[PDB]
Design a protein around this ligand. Structure first.
Ligand SMILES: Cc1c(C(=O)O)cnn1-c1ccccc1
Length: 126
């Protein structure tokens, strides 16, 4: 069901949360080789989540489920905001710009928390 599919996407999202916080600790401690590997892991996790979310949105549209479509349109738009900030963080790491990295890390935390306040409504609508 789209709902088992939603729970699958939610767990993948949670895996990125977990890896992100381990990565933030590694960044603070100065362990750049660890950060590099976590950033690759996260890229894969975020690419996977994006794919699952598009499949859920496409299934909502074929169902003609208007409230689910509306909420997933908003949620996916916010996801692209996170994606752009994440890509900028990765570039700041590549450039050795720790100031920008710290900034982007903070901004991403605020974007993802705001984004996840839509989850309750998505789950009831799907
Ligand atoms: C997971 C997520 C959300 C959310 O879960 O609401 C909002 N943006 N992002 C995101 C974070 C990093 C990369 C791409 C997207």
């Amino acid at each position: 069901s789209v709902k088992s599919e939603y729970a699958e996407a939610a767990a993948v999202g949670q895996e990125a949360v977990a890896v992100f916080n381990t990565m933030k600790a590694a960044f603070q401690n100065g362990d750049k080789e660890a950060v590099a590997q976590y950033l690759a892991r996260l890229a894969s996790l975020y690419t996977r989540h994006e794919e699952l979310l598009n499949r859920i949105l496409e299934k909502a549209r074929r169902e003609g489920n208007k409230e689910a479509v509306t909420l997933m349109n908003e949620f996916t738009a916010t996801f692209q905001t996170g994606k752009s900030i994440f890509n900028a963080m990765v570039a700041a790491f590549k450039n050795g710009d720790d100031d920008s990295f710290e900034s982007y890390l903070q901004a991403l935390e605020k974007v993802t928390a705001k984004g996840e306040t839509l989850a309750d409504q998505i789950a009831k609508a799907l």
